[PDB]
Amino acid sequence: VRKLKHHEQKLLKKVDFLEWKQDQGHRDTQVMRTYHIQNREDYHKYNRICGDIRRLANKLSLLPPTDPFRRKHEQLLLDKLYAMGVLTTKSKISDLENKVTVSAICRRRLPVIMHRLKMAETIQDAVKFIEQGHVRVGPNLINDPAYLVTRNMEDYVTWVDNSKIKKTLLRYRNQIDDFDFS
Amino acid sequence: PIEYLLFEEPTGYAVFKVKLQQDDIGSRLKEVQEQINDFGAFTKLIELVSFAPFKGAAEALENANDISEGLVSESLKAILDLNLPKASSKKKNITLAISDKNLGPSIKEEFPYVDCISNELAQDLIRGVRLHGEKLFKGLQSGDLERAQLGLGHAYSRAKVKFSVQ
Amino acid sequence: KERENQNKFERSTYTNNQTKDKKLRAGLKKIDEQYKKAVSSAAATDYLLPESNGYLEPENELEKTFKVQQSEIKSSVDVSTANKALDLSLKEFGPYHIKYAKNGTHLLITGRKGHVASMDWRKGQLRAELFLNETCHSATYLQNEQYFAVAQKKYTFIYDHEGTELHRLKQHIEARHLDFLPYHYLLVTAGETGWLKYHDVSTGQLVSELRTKAGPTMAMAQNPWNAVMHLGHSNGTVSLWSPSMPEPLVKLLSARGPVNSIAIDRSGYYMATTGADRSMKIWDIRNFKQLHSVESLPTPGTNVSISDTGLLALSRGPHVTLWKDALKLSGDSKPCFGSMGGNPHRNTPYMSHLFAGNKVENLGFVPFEDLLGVGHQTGITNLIVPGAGEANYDALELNPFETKKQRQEQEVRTLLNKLPADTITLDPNSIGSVDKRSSTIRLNAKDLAQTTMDANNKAKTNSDIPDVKPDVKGKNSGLRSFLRKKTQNVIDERKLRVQKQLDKEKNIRKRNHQIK
Amino acid sequence: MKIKTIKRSADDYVPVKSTQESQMPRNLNPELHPFERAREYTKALNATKLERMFAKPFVGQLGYGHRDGVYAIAKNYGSLNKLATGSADGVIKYWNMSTREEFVSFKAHYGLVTGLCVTQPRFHDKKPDLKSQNFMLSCSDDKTVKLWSINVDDYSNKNNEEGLIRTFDGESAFQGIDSHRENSTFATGGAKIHLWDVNRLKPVSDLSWGADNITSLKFNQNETDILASTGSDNSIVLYDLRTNSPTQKIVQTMRTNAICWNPMEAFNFVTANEDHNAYYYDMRNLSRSLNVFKDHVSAVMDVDFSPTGDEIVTGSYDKSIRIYKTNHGHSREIYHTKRMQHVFQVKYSMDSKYIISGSDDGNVRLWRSKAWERSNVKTTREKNKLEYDEKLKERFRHMPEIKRISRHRHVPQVIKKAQEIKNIELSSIKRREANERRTRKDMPYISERKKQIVGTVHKYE
Amino acid sequence: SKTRYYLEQCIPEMDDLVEKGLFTKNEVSLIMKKRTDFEHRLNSRGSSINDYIKYINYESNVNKLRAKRCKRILQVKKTNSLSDWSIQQRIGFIYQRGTNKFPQDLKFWAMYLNYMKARGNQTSYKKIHNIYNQLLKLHPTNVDIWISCAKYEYEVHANFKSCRNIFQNGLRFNPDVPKLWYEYVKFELNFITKLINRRKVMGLINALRGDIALTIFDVCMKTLGKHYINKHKGYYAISDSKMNIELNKETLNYLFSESLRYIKLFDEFLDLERDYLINHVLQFWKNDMYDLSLRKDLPELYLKTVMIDITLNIRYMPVEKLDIDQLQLSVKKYFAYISKLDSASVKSLKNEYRSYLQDNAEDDPRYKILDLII
RNA sequence: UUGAACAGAGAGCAUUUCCGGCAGCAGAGAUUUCAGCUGU
């Protein structure tokens, strides 16, 4: 912590007060900084599900390469994860080990969907807006940031009517019709 | 054995007593060469026992010319006769470290019991006390040593060139 | 040379249950002279000790000491100590587990709800106030105020000086008790799982996982002398553990029911355990005798603590009660609650206090000051306990006035001389010695030749066989115990000559019986 | 009720003026300082590891070496940094070891200069000027002993006819030379050992036991009138110069390459011989060595004592040198280099801190006697730390974990393989002598310290 | 740390001082915490000679309290154990440490010398010699140390040989201040006066002259003149002959004013041949000084020396028998001066008349003197 | 290599030669300390 001299750094090399090997390079912290994750245990709650997908993918690739059970369940899991939005392509089954990843499950969260739909300028702005209760999917208002938005369910991410944000974008283009409140 | 050290300087003469010898065989090594830069270890080698200051710039210029042309002046005779012990002239002379190999013969002409050393060990002891200067002297001189150096350099140069103000 | 206080500075040694070498004789004589000179000169330092310990003394027979009030102490003592006697009223989060740094400079409080605050309690400087909204249980500093470990809902987390999270430990699954071993740099962890985990803070490496095998860990304390961990279980059993042996070093039967709290003296000699059977028990640690058994407390003692000057602070809910000189051998030092008719041979409480609103969560003495910090349901309260702190610290072990540069260099130096976790034994002086195998006389190779000689001639002298002796009640004759302890189906030459010498013994016993 | 608490007062613990250091109160209670065995065990382990990383013993080679391998070296026993070396091609050189550069070189002879030493030549007509001239004399196989003077810049008292002030002459070759430490005398071994003085041009006395030649020579350093010599009939002969005669000889198994006398004990000497070990002998009883220094793997070429008399240095024909504590009998340290071949001469400088080795590729190299020890002057904090660490390594010396670290060196491949086959050979002969002793009746237990003397004139009672 | 070493060097004397039942443990802990304060201030950074001085004053105060408590408790005046010299030895070592650290304040050096001298029989005069030797080595130019060294070794020990050696070595070092010259002629006159008084005393119970003082007087004039002509006109001799003669005149004025002070404090040594010892300085001043003190300027100084040579027998009391013997000498002096001088004639006449009138029934013989010097 | 007288150093080593006991008395410096004679 004091920038050890040469004899000290030679004499105690494995000493590190910040980065440990159980930390795994602080990647929970790293991807929760990237996608602005509030609570500490969401990374590991997603890591359990990525481990489920990859455990099944291992145990399913250990079946013989031609039997219809392996082919049906590999294709069925691939279709389910593409439809949910974690996987970005349902083509190859090496996605079920390589491209299945806590960052993919985190890119499917509601503020990241928002920021990619240009509905907020950054992920922290999207977090603030859906905490303030501006965003509804479908009819019903969504209030928490961790909400996972599937591919067919991202067509209905809008703002609530009577939103001040909806009002100011309509009045920026002065398409505001005050009959329907905005 | 390098027992005493004579440092001449514009404010006067200094006799130092060598406490610890530096290494002779390892004298070119890195730690021995930079212990004379570190002051905390140079004070383990050198201790000041005497400093006779000059009577003014006139005696300063006289002793600067005598030190320049390699002669023992009367103030040198006084301070060396005060400080150096009456050793033998035939067996184990007292060893004085100077920086001037042609001032040495003038010192043995006056004190035959003194052998004088100016080789690389005495040279880097001398440049250690030159490098530290005012810190070794413990506060006992009047006059800043660089101000006396400016005065003595200008006086020496005008004397050597015979600068007339007429 | 005499030194009336030498036996504090003396040092025990090995004994057998003189020499002809001249050089070794004079070497041992010089060693004994040096040991005597060193003990004497080390014990003459008690002149140089700057301060004096505190006290309070009754000066009357009507003036009992347990009925002296904290406001009366705060009036009677100086303004600096009266300002050290702090009180934080933190009502909304839960009961506050208290913890002090090993020099008394920093305080670390944890609410049960989420509120963890590390602070300089004696200035007004807090340096971490973090609200971790899951139920925290305990915390401790590591080697400094610069890092602290908190035991949260499940995982133990490690935070830096200003409160940023450094580590989430994926092991240490449900901690309830954390304690740091400062000379070994080990964070020790126990809780609702029946597991005890030693984690090296410097390298980052989980040193040991040990099955307690006795359910959740009800109490936990560290011997400051030899760094073994005393855990108290729901059996009424304390067990002393080291990170080398996967079994407990010792298991003591302290109480009935569970063990609510354990405290150890800093000399490593006495241990006070409170059980849930309303029983405080003072234990000798070194010889494992039970010194005192104060049974039938009015309500179960939820905490015990032992100061640096040997006070005993027991806490039974609202009440805190301190006894002086209770950790001694004699039966006149058994801690009582009243003196029946004024008996001087009854250890009445040294002082008591009642936290009338609440139930105290934990106790901890402030290290080098005369205070007892008790954390309770509505925050923190320091109590001015005058006999309760080492007045003369050593400033190069741990310094209450230490600066930032001194903290930096002391951190690097103690990190450099970190003791390995394998050196933790029940006694600390057992890592210079020789094995308790490997014969106590050193061998001079003449006797090695002699040993190999009788190993060659174990046959036909039967030196590895029990000797024939007829009069030894031949149902327990040694040779038949050899024959029965051996497996009864294999036949080797050793057991053949035991059978031969057994028949010889039976025939000699037969003829001795016949002539008798 | 009287009452008193801890009044810390902050004037005694944090100083008033900012320029001065903080008070460090101490309290020597073992309660305050708990882990007293483990803490200094780890300090002794960190001291052994720090020594094994600070071991940088090679100071430097001096000059450019010689052309044909250094076979003779002599320090002068009165000046710290002066060293004379001679090679196989007859060139001798005088060295300032401070600047690592030769004062002078000399094409001294035509053959090998087989010996050289240094003198303060007591002429009784001239007066020796030892403050500006140094004197080295040197014998070779071209039947000459030559005495040279060197211009030396060590005092600046004066201001000159340097080389070859005289030329002693023998009829047969010479093989060794050593100068008496007084009274103008030296001795040369060769076909026969002669005594000389620097005035007369002929030997004063021939002091030879028999008609068997002499390979080496050393004068004693105190009791200066006792000579010792090694003859090629595996013989070690002592001479006395009061009686002007030999004194006693012993015959060993193999040939003694060198002797050096103990400068602090005046009757002990160490021989360095061709079975690969050194023998520490008492002059008053040559029937047993009082040590054997065993760790070399080829023939030991040269030995020398520390001027403190406490350790010896020992260079051998396996291209490595070894330093031995005098009371142990195994090597404290081994120095090797891929560039160093066949170290034929080793001296121990009068500082007792550096070790001069002359190899046979040509080079003369300086080493530190203590590898981890630096030569700066030390403040009292670092001096106290260093001697605390020395005492701590001393009292934990035999713990297995620090013994395996302090015992460790990198030895070359050839010396390591010779070492392990030497181990399995010695273990085999111990197995076979144990069997033979189990059977046979009267097998005497001969000591290791007596196992190398085949005989001794003037038997001991 | 070294404060720890010094503090635990202080413990055997208080072992002994608790065993001898005068101090108690609770008060000796108080003197140890005060001494801890002082030792830490001594050997930490930013140290001061006032820290040394206050430590010496504290140690002397606890020594005086220890003596008072010994006389009151044990009713002896020393316990002849460790605790009656250890504290004075401590004070001497604090002085030695302070003079090794700050060897520049002569106040502290002289406090060291005063305490070491006043320690009495218990100290050693070679221990005072050692600190005189190192102080004179460090300050060779400061002259009062030479005077104090020689004054201690003559006015206490009466060591004439060593005192002569001290004065000759000091005059070797700084032969420029006249104060050392005057104290050397003072010492030589005191030595010759003690010599002739011990001769007179051995006569009254039962060659070697002031020519030593005259020879050191002669070299005093020569070397003081040389050092003033070298001190002024400092760097070079770039000055024309007007400035050279102005300089040489001024050095004559300087040197002759010092010899005026020499005779003025020379007259009071009246136990030797004071007439001869003043007349030799008169004849040493009477000769030529290479720039015509008589035949040119410094004629006022020539008149001053003529007045001195006139009154050199008339240095007498109002009992003027010497005046009635040799006032004709003063009349011939005034006649020989007024035979040449012009205004110094009238000046010397009026001055000798005013001097004799000021210095000299009794008014009737004084009326004869007034008629003589009228 | 020894001897002699001389000049010294404070840098070593003994031992019972005296003192660090008491007064009487004069002396010394700034009311405390300092310096010698006649006996205990």
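The first strand of chain B starts at residue 4 and ends at 9.
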